[PDB]
Each structure stands twice: as structure tokens, then as C-alpha cells.
Design a protein around this ligand. Structure first.
Ligand code: THV
Ligand code: THV
Ligand code: K
Ligand code: K
Ligand code: K
Ligand code: K
Ligand code: MN
Ligand code: MN
Lengths: 383, 329, 329, 383
């Protein structure tokens, strides 16, 4: 018997390299087919009508908002935008499986999590416009949302940096005996970053109650997954770090819900990380800065399920399409009319307390504007 | 001066420089995130089709990997032209640049080197880039002996400086002012040419004050010089530093010795910004000639904001006001 | 004024500060490479046995992970005291420090923060550390708004400054001069106390020249002041900067206004070193008062060498010579 | 059938999380037992006597050098040292399977590779002493060896940084149509770094002829593997990146040789990376700065084998011990008496050329030494 401290194994007397199983990878967990029918009753979560309607309406309201804000960006009303097309089911299905106080860390394409948590349309709009109502004070680019009240950590552009951070927050939760889980969303491209390796390893060695949720949509901007990795996606990486892993059909809200619900239950109970790789497809452009032509939908699937239960119909669909549009436009129009925040806000929150040298720079700007103000858009900014 | 030219904007001049390099150097390869289809700023359009998938290719999304990989290629003597998508994301590779690339030749007694590596990256403000698509990280690298940091102000300058970077026998970081990628085009030679590194350019001669900047800020100080002549009757010597390290101490000191006044401007934050190194050095060498304190007109000591961009940047009005006060001193 | 004291060397004063912190703050945790058994420099000895394995523990060998993890703990409001084994290895975490930690509060409009994070790391030359166990990376961090960078000169200073960093509501980087870990002991209060951040200390009053340094270099300039008094009859004001950012601009300027001369010294390389920011700022604020060019005596613009260390460091002779020349100017 | 671009798999209708099997990990390949007996005749490489004796003599010579240098550090004659106790078989066994021009990237505990490649004792000593004969010009700490002629890239302290670099060197070799492989050594602790993740992934996606060789010796300074990772060591991580992997008994020169020989053969022919995790135990202290107590052998095993072939005996053992001690002591004493290089070498090689401002600093030091020279060890350095 081998006595090496680094591994637990038996000896082998023949040379055999271990081959990866990529052609026949980890299977994709699916609850309902493309016609919205439950394939295996034992897997039905039997979520109540009100809950399933919330999943549907959250997904569709987000799609409505995306269409409007994407257009707003094309018109130059907002400086940037990133849509969530084809991925709405991964957001709402997973959010619905969490407790509303579970802390969320994301990448930038998980707005459905906030929508499900009832983040006001006014606040999504305020951040995109950088107006006075933005709790982010107009400092970050559009779609860089955050909400302390709804336990959603402010998004940041550097990819994967939130991964080891989510792990630290999960360790702190464990210590606090909170009975809370941390969920951390990222794309398959971000998974290539060194910080993903850091986070996955730390969560396992430090025994953290965290769910790693990977959105595998087939592309990282123009890069197909064939140029991103050569192993069996991201799910296959989990076991090597000692992390319980699973792959699910991201276009199936129920499969996503089921996997997230089980991962949460066990993560909290056992203080152990879980990895969920949700397979989808990035239907829209990577962003408003991208023209995807240069290189099975979650909403329709759930709609067919709803019809099958007698829970929706063409008339209700039409009325909701109308109401959602009115709601988004109302918030949109309000957001556009609001002034931007006071330019003085460019200097606060750098440190908790403003250093004297920083206040001197703030005063410098004030004096500058007193003399050269006509050359600045002062009329569009507060005070 | 340089044969047949062609109108090119800044991204086009970068593509021309890269095309020229791969044509004359068969070891040269270009790689990074999304470079195969032409790049997110179109800097590599057509190169893969022309030179092959083994020579212009995409890497995994991992900056530390990109630079480590580029260093390894350079260790074998092959030309490695790495791309970092935005200068803001060069930080994951800081360790590979500072502890490895910069120290490679020194630490091995010249047994090994990564002299054939060039890292190119979009840089500077872009109007709405906010915290992570607007940074100017040159001062972080200026404190690292062993690397060269170069920043051009135009398409003609970009092609000549980038070719000099690619050919230089030291690891180089070439920062491309992204706001200029599609700005005005200018005539650029289609065949290769070089512009020397560690040489500043006096683009406008003057006698009352010396103004120094780099990248897009050079265009701001050219405008300030015009405003100063018009409104104050002040003659400004306008200088493009071009190379951050090793910098052209001589050209700058020579100018200040004549004018007696210096104003340095950069988009990067003031504290620890490269203007402090220039100001300190100039004061050391030109103490007997300085008639006023040296002025630094820089970005504020904050992250780079989204909605507040117009108030954050060291614009022509901020530079002019500081110049006015310095002249009246 | 501080209650009962005990003779403690630097490593002991650090353990004392850490012990005091965990005692009064139940959320505090200490983590990093090899901290469980007491650390490679003995700074965490006895802490795990006293406070528990869940509060003083080892991480995998990954600096980007250590800082990202620490930031995450701090996001929840818990005190996170991360250790980076040698300041030379802080660079893999540069992105997490600069892009994340420093900008956390600002970018969220104060909805989230990591103010309760402190990163502590061994720093400075040690006689034989060479390129990777000798670095002084403060100037790299000085150009990043949002973090504080603090360096003590002795055991009493270290405990008070470290407690201030741990308690400060902003991410702090605390560099411990490793050559002092087992050097001479000094009286250190057993109970907790604080030394304010962003406050320099005039440790010796003088009228002819102002000398500025930090870390072990403060001891070098104290000796230079003694040499200048004895050999030239020059009266030096010796100042310990203590906090690199945000720095005590006022204390330094007030001194130079009185003396009219300034010499700044640091082990870190000259170019882009922090002395450039101090020199530039002093020249801007004390132009009318300066009798000579400001002197900077620093390490050379090279990597930190093994066999050549005695020739690399800005020792008392180098500083003294520069001072003699500045006085005779 | 699943249509997702990110993975190749079938659907599954039951929720099943993939568990790592760490208790029964990847088996450890062994060729000979602890008594030097060949366990399975078909696996015996039947290496010629001269070659096996070279493996044995390289290991013992390295061991003799380690003993002497370790003791010299304790005697205050060199400033630092790191021994290779217990890992001599991983070095020589792998080195013997490579072609002599295959490029090596290492960490610091692979000196036996250089020994096998006949790096002069005088040069190992020159580096440790930082003397005039050091090809590294006395700039790095002891044990940071490098050899252009023997294709061994200069060691650097930052852990794992050589991993993606080695991958880049392999890519360049592929392009040059070299018919060469790159081998890259690192410890289980260094494998936790983000650069390890970068290198493993790049090698697979970019199809590089590289062998990743992990020395898993149970500890990273004071850190046991239980605090370093939770998966089945490092070998289990390979497949997740699409890398052919194997685990071998590091205390068995023949298992190491066999695995390395096959990996090289296949890496060069197929342009694909290979991962070998060699299980061992760190017998000595981490370094001369560490005191281990605060937290079978490859040589005796091979010695047993030699005796069974009638290839060694006690007289030869005594003779070789005596001769190796003499060769090491002669190089050691000669190295100690050499001057250190000219202090001017402090300034060259920072850049290829010497920038005028750097030259100015060299001139400043020259002027300084003309006046204050008595306060410096000038007589010990070349002039
Ligand atoms: C460290 C690093 N490197 C590169 C980028 C550039 N970038 C991006 C941005 O800058 C956004 C926030 C506008 S998004 C992106 C592709 C990420 O792909 P993914 O598969 O992780 O995610 P998606 O398919 O959902 O977009 C890159 C390379 C980045 N944001 N961070
Ligand atoms: C990026 C980084 N972080 C920490 C260290 C400190 N360190 C070391 C040194 O500084 C040596 C070169 C003197 S060695 C070491 C442990 C490496 O453990 P390992 O399992 O990779 O290798 P061994 O068991 O063979 O030593 C650390 C953490 C380091 N060298 N590099
Ligand atoms: K992020
Ligand atoms: K170059
Ligand atoms: K703090
Ligand atoms: K290394
Ligand atoms: Mn993607
Ligand atoms: Mn180890």
C-alpha cells in the first residue's frame, strides 16, 4: 500500500495514462422537453402556480427591458448595454431556489437575479443613465448593478475577480453560523482566469457554503469554447478540486431550479462547495459594442409548460406584453428626465473619509467651474 | 520621406505595423483575446487570413497566461506580440511583467532573455469607459527597471514606435490611445519605418514655457499653446514624451533650461503619476533656470468615473488656467 | 501613558498587535501561507492555539486567492488580516488590490466595501534576499487611490500603526521591515494603542536641512544627521513619513519652509520611487523657500542583487555625501 | 440530443451530482518494489548498465553535494541552501528520459536534472557563492541555477511563473518544427497558483508538446497537502483540462523514467501536453531558513536493484562515496576562494544595452567608491 501523504490510492503495475472523457462528457440534466412537458415526474418540483408565473413574468419583463435598453444604446441615450437573451432561465431558475438573503456575486449577465428579487425598474434605469437616483452615484458603466438591500454585490468589469471574493464571504457566513449560502455567477470565458482556480481551490480546502454557477453560453465575445478549453467544459473541472459538480440544461428553468435547490441545501448543511454549469447559448450580441455576425428558448419552453397546465393563454400573453412594455417605458422616460448627480460625487467614497489632499482637489474643481463653467454641462448635473 | 503613404487612422496604422512585422520576421506571432477575427478594436483585421492560424490566434481568457506564454515564446528567440484587451486588465499579468519579464535578462546573467516580447494594449479615456475601460497605467510600470513603456500620439507615430518596440531587444509595453483608434486619419508609409524609443519630440518650438504630455494629451497641450499665444501672448514649447521609460531626460531639461517654466499633464491620477518623476528630475537638473514652481495638471486621485468623465479629465481649460497662473507667478 | 510595557523586537510587537486585535474583535481572522504554525517570521506564534483553527489558518499557495478571499470576508463586515509571505510576492494579487480592494467602496456608491481588510507583508532588504526577498514595492501602490500604505520604523511604531491599519475603515497594506524582525528590542505597551495614519513624525528637530525616510531607512538618516552635525556642523530635522498614502504633505512642507533644503531617501529604485512624489509636491509648495535642488538618494534602477547588495543600498555614506553637496550648493 | 456548443454529452433525466473519488484516487505507477525487485517483467525498461549507473551516480553525487552545502550554510559559509533529499529519483529518472536538447523549466528543487546533464560542480558552487565564475553574475540567491548550453532555464523565486512560460516555449518549438519537447517542473504547493491554471489550459487549447512534471512531496513549507487541496492531488486536475495524466512512485527511478519516456514520445508526435504527478516525500527541511520539526529512499531502492544485477557492491559504494566527497570538496573550497564579480555588473543586463541614465548611476557609484571605498568590501570583488 502507498504511504504518500499527497494522495490516497493503490499501486498499479502497468503504465496507463488517464484519458479525459470529452466526446462523452458529463450529461446535461433536463426536467422538461422543448415542448414544456415534464419528462420524468419524479423530477418535477411541483412549484405552485404563483411561483411559476413569477418565474415567467420575471424572464419576460427582463427581455422587454433588454429590448428597450438595447435600442436606447443604439440611439446613444445610454453609453453601453449588455443583453440577457437566451439566459433568462438560468437567472430566474437559480434565484428562485435561493433564500432571498443569500448573498449573490455576479459577472454582468445575471440581471434576471435582481429582477426576480424585485429590484425596481427605476433603479436598473438609474444605473444605466448614471442619474441622481443611482445608488452607484453614476460612477460605473451601465449594467454594473448592485443592491445592499437585495443582497446582490455590485458588479465590476474585471472578469472572475468576484470568485475568490464570494468564497471569502462564504467563509465569513460559515463562521457567523448564519445558515446562509453564497452564490457566485461567471461565464465560461471568465472560468479561464487564474482567480477561478484560486476560488475553486479555496472553497474546497476551507470548506465554504458556496455555489459556483457557470453560464456556459458557447462564446466569450468572438471566442468559441473550442479555443477556450479542451476538457469537458467547466463541470469536469469541479471534481479535481474536490467539488460536487453537475451540468444542467440552462434553457430549462426547472432543471436549473432543481440543481440550485439541492446544491443550496447541501452547501449550507455540509459547508461544502457545489458547482453548476448551465448550458445555454448567447442569443444576442456580446454587448452593444459587438456585432456577433462578424464571427430552444427558456421563455418559450416555460410558456408551453404554462399552457399545458391551463395557467396562461394567448390573451394573457398579449395583456402582459402590453403591461410590461408600459412599465418599462414609464421607468425609462422617468430615468431620462432626471439630472445626473452633483459632480462633487466624483470625489466621495474613494476612502470612507475624504483625505485633505482629495478635498483640495474637490475645491480645485469648484473654483475651476466658477471661472470656466460655461464650458461644462452644468445644467445636466445636480446643483 | 518614407516612400508611398496611405491615409490610416490609428487602428489601421497598428495593423500596418503588425502586417510589416509578420512579413519580414517569420518567427513573429500575434495572440490574445479575440485577436483572430480582427480584434475588438479591429487592430488585427485580415492578419490571420494573410499569415495563418498558427501565427495570429486567440488564447484562453487569462491575462497572466497571455504574458507568461508570450515570455516563453520570446525565451526561444521568436517575436511574440501579445495583446491585452484593455490596459485596465493588464493587472492580472503584473507579476509576470514585473517579476519575470523585466528581470529575465538581469537575473540569468544574460543566459536567457525575453527581449522579443511586445505587449500592446488599448489605453486612456474614451468618453464613457468608466473605471475599467479608461485607465492609464504607465506610472505603475515606470517603477520597474527592465521594461520599456511607449505611447504614441497619432497614426504615423504609432506605426513607427510600434515597429521600434517589436524590434527592440527588451520587453516593451506599447499603449494605444483608444480614443484615437477611429479619430482623424493621416498619411502613413505602407512600408516599415522606425521612430526611436527614449526620444521625446519637440513638436512646436517656444520660448516662455515648456509643456509636456503624451498620448491624446499631446493634442490637448497643442490647443493650450494656441490659447496661450492668442489670449496671453505666451510662446509655448510643446513636447511629446513618447517613451515613459527609459525617458528622454535630456530633451526635456534642454527645453526647460531655455524657457524656465514647465507644465506636465497626464490623464492618470496625480499622486504617483509619471509627472512626479519628470518634475523631480527637472527640478534636480534645472534649479538655476526654473522661474516658477513646476505645474502638474492631472486626473484627480480617484477611480475613473462614468457619468463624471467631463469633470475628471485634465482638459484644455484646466491646463490653460494652471499655465496662466504659472506665467503670472 | 500607555500602561505597562515590555521589551519587544518587531516580530514580537506584530504578534502583540495581532493578539490584541483578535481579543477585542471576535470577527477578526488571520490567514495566508504558513501562518498556522506561527509564520516563517514567527509573527503568528501561539495565535491559533489561543483563538482557534477557524480564526488563524493556512490558505493554499495562491496570492491572488489570498487577497480576493480577504476582500470577500471584509465585504461581510468581518475583520480580515491577510498575510503575503514576502512583499516581493504581492504582485500576483495586484489586480485584486488595485482594481478590486481600492475601488470597492467608490464603485458601489458605498453600498459595499472591504474597509475591514488589512494586508501585512515582510518588506525591504535583508542582506542576502536578492531579487525576490528584498523588494520595497510601496511606490507601485502609491499610484492607487482607495488604499492606504503604511511602513513602521520600530517595534513601538509597528504595533501602534498596525492596530490603526486593522481598525481603519479602508483597505490597508502594512509593510514590516523584515531586517528589523529580530533586531534590537524596545519598550512596547502590552495593551492596545494607536498611532495615527497619514501623520509623519519629526523625530529630531533641525534648522539647516530636512531629511525624510521610512522603514529601516529612518535609522540611516538618523545616523546621517549625527554625521552631519559632527563633520559639518549642520543641523538636520529627521522625519519618519510612516504613511506612504495618503501622506502627511503638511508636516513635510512645514519643515522644508523652515529649513529650505530637503533630502529624501528610500531603498526602492529611484525612477518612479515615492521620493519623486514628495519632491514634486514640496517644490510646488515651498518654491520660495528652497535654497537648493531637492536630493533623492535611493536604490539604483536595477533589480535587487544578491552579491552586490552592499553596493546597491542608499547607505549612510551615500546619503551623507549627497547632503554635503546639497549644503555646499 | 443536446445541441449546446460548450460540451459534448447526452441528456440525463435524473438529478445526479458528480462526486470526486479522492479516497480511491488515481493509482500510483510502480516498476520496482522497495527491495529493488522488478514487479512486472513487461514494464522493465532493461536500461543498459552504464545508463543505470549514471542514474545512481548522479543521485548520490547530488546527495553528497547537498550534505556539504547544507552544512556549509549552517557554518555560515553560503547564505542559503535548499536540499533535494528524497527527490533525487524524480530528477534523474525524468532527465534520463529526455533528449539532451529538450528545454527544462523548473522551480528550485530539481538540481539533479542539471547533475544528470553534467553541469559542472564548479558552476553549482559559483552560483551558491555568487563568485566571478557564476554565469548568473552573482545576481540571484543560491540554488537559482541556469544553463543555456544544457538547456536549463534560469530558476526564479516566484512560484509557478515558469508554467505558462514553458507552454509558450513549447508552442514556439512546435512552430520551429523542432522535434523537441519542453518539460516544466513544479511542486504541489506551486500548483495552487493561478499561473498553473493558465499553463495547463493554454497547453491543451494551443496543442503544445509539453510535459508538466509535478513533484508532490507532501508539504509546501509547513503546509500539509490537506490544507493545499481537497481533490485527488494534482494528477486528477489534468483530465479536466483535456490533458493526458499519470501518477507515479517518485521513489522509483524506473517508474519515473518509463512515464517520462512515454509522455515525451507522445507529446512530440501528437503536440499535446502530458501531466506526470510524482509522489514522494520531502525528507529534508524546506530550506536552511526552515526547521521542519516545528510542524524508503530513491537511492537505496536503486542500490538494491544494482546489487541484484551484480552491478554494484560495498567496495564500489565506498570508493564512489570517497571520490564524490573529494570532487565536491575541491569545487567547494575553490569556489569559496574566488573573488566576487566586478561591482559594475550590478548595472548591466537590466536592459540589453545600458540606458544613459543607468550609466550615470554606475558613474555615481564609481565616484562614491573613489572617496568612501574603505567602507566597502572592494578587495573581495573583481577590479
Ligand atoms: C480580466 C478581463 N479581461 C478582459 C475583459 C474584457 N471582456 C469583457 C468586458 O470588458 C465587459 C465587462 C464589457 S466581457 C468578456 C468576455 C467574457 O466572456 P464569458 O464567457 O465569461 O461571459 P459572457 O459570454 O456572458 O459575455 C471580456 C473578455 C474583462 N472584462 N476582464
Ligand atoms: C508566488 C510565491 N509565493 C510564495 C513564495 C515563498 N515560498 C518559497 C521561496 O520563497 C523560496 C524560493 C526561497 S518556497 C515555498 C513553498 C513551495 O512549495 P512547493 O510544494 O511548491 O515546493 P517544495 O515542497 O519542493 O518546496 C514558498 C511558499 C514564493 N517563492 N513565491
Ligand atoms: K468582476
Ligand atoms: K521587444
Ligand atoms: K483596514
Ligand atoms: K519560477
Ligand atoms: Mn460565454
Ligand atoms: Mn511540496
Amino acid at each position: 500500500k502507498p504511504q504518500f501523504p499527497g494522495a490516497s490510492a493503490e499501486f498499479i503495475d502497468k503504465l496507463e495514462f488517464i484519458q479525459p472523457n470529452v466526446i462523452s462528457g458529463i450529461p446535461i440534466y433536463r426536467v422538461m422537453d422543448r415542448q414544456g412537458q415534464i419528462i420524468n415526474p419524479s423530477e418535477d418540483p411541483h412549484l405552485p402556480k404563483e411561483k411559476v408565473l413569477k418565474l415567467y413574468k420575471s424572464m419576460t419583463l427582463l427581455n422587454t427591458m433588454d429590448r428597450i435598453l438595447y435600442e436606447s444604446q443604439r440611439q446613444g441615450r445610454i453609453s453601453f448595454y449588455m443583453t440577457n437573451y437566451g439566459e433568462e432561465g438560468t437567472h430566474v431558475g437559480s434565484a428562485a431556489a435561493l433564500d432571498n438573503t443569500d448573498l449573490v456575486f455576479g459577472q454582468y449577465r445575471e440581471a434576471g437575479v435582481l429582477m426576480y428579487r424585485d429590484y425596481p425598474l427605476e433603479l436598473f434605469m438609474a444605473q444605466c443613465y448614471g442619474n441622481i437616483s443611482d445608488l452607484g452615484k453614476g460612477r460605473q458603466m451601465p449594467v454594473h448593478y448592485g443592491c445592499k438591500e437585495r443582497h446582490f454585490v455590485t458588479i465590476s468589469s474585471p472578469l472572475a475577480t468576484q470568485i475568490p471574493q464570494a468564497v471569502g464571504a462564504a467563509y465569513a457566513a460559515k463562521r457567523a453560523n448564519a445558515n446562509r449560502v453564497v452564490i457566485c455567477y461567471f461565464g465560461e470565458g471568465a472560468a479561464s482566469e487564474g482567480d477561478a482556480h484560486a476560488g475553486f481551490n479555496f472553497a474546497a480546502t476551507l470548506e465554504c457554503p458556496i455555489i459556483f454557477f457557470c453560464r456556459n453560453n458557447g462564446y466569450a465575445i468572438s471566442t468559441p469554447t473550442s479555443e477556450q478549453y479542451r476538457g469537458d467544459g467547466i463541470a469536469a473541472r469541479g471534481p479535481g478540486y474536490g467539488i460536487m459538480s453537475i451540468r444542467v440544461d440552462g434553457n430549462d428553468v426547472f432543471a436549473v431550479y432543481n440543481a440550485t435547490k439541492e446544491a443550496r441545501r447541501r452547501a449550507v448543511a455540509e459547508n461544502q462547495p457545489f458547482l453548476i454549469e448551465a448550458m445555454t447559448y448567447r442569443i444576442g450580441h456580446h454587448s452593444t459594442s459587438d456585432d456577433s455576425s462578424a464571427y430552444d428558448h427558456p421563455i418559450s419552453r416555460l410558456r408551453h409548460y404554462l399552457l399545458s397546465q391551463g395557467w396562461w393563454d394567448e390573451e394573457q400573453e398579449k395583456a402582459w406584453r402590453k403591461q410590461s412594455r408600459r412599465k418599462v417605458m414609464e421607468a425609462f422616460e422617468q430615468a431620462e428626465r432626471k439630472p445626473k448627480p452633483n459632480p462633487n460625487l466624483l470625489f466621495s467614497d474613494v476612502y470612507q473619509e475624504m483625505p485633505a489632499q482629495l478635498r483640495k482637489q474637490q475645491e480645485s474643481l469648484a473654483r475651476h467651474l466658477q471661472t470656466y463653467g460655461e464650458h461644462y454641462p452644468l445644467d445636466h448635473f445636480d446643483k | 520621406e518614407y516612400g508611398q503613404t496611405q491615409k490610416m487612422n490609428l487602428f489601421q496604422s497598428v495593423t500596418s505595423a503588425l502586417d510589416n512585422s509578420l512579413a519580414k520576421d517569420p518567427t513573429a506571432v500575434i495572440f490574445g483575446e479575440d485577436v483572430a477575427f480582427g480584434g475588438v478594436f479591429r487592430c488585427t483585421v485580415g492578419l490571420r487570413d494573410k499569415y495563418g492560424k498558427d501565427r495570429v490566434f486567440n488564447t484562453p481568457l487569462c491575462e497572466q497566461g497571455i504574458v507568461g506564454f508570450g515570455i516563453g515564446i520570446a525565451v526561444t528567440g521568436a517575436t511574440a506580440i501579445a495583446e491585452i484587451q484593455f490596459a485596465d486588465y493588464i493587472f492580472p499579468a503584473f507579476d509576470q511583467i514585473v517579476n519575470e519579464a523585466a528581470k529575465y535578462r538581469y537575473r540569468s546573467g544574460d543566459l536567457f532573455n525575453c527581449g522579443s516580447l511586445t505587449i500592446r494594449s488599448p489605453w486612456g479615456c474614451v468618453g464613457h469607459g468608466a473605471l475599467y475601460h479608461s485607465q492609464s497605467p504607465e506610472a505603475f510600470f515606470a517603477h520597474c527597471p527592465g521594461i520599456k513603456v511607449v505611447i504614441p500620439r497619432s497614426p504615423f507615430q504609432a506605426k513607427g514606435l510600434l515597429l521600434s518596440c517589436i524590434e527592440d531587444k527588451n520587453p516593451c509595453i506599447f499603449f494605444e490611445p483608444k480614443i484615437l483608434y477611429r479619430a482623424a486619419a493621416e498619411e502613413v508609409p505602407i512600408e516599415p519605418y522606425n521612430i526611436p524609443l527614449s526620444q521625446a519630440e519637440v513638436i512646436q518650438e517656444g520660448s516662455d514655457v515648456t509643456l509636456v504630455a503624451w498620448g491624446t494629451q499631446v493634442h490637448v497641450i497643442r490647443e493650450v499653446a494656441s490659447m496661450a499665444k492668442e489670449k496671453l501672448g505666451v510662446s509655448c514649447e510643446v513636447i511629446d514624451l513618447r517613451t515613459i521609460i527609459p525617458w528622454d531626460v535630456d530633451t526635456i531639461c534642454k527645453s526647460v533650461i531655455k524657457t524656465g517654466r514647465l507644465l506636465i499633464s497626464h490623464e492618470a491620477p496625480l499622486t504617483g503619476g509619471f509627472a512626479s518623476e519628470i518634475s523631480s528630475t527637472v527640478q534636480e537638473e534645472c534649479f538655476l533656470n526654473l522661474e516658477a514652481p513646476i505645474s502638474r495638471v492631472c486626473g484627480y486621485d480617484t477611480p475613473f468615473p462614468h457619468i463624471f468623465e467631463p469633470f475628471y479629465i485634465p482638459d484644455k481649460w484646466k491646463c490653460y488656467d494652471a499655465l496662466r497662473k504659472m506665467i503670472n507667478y
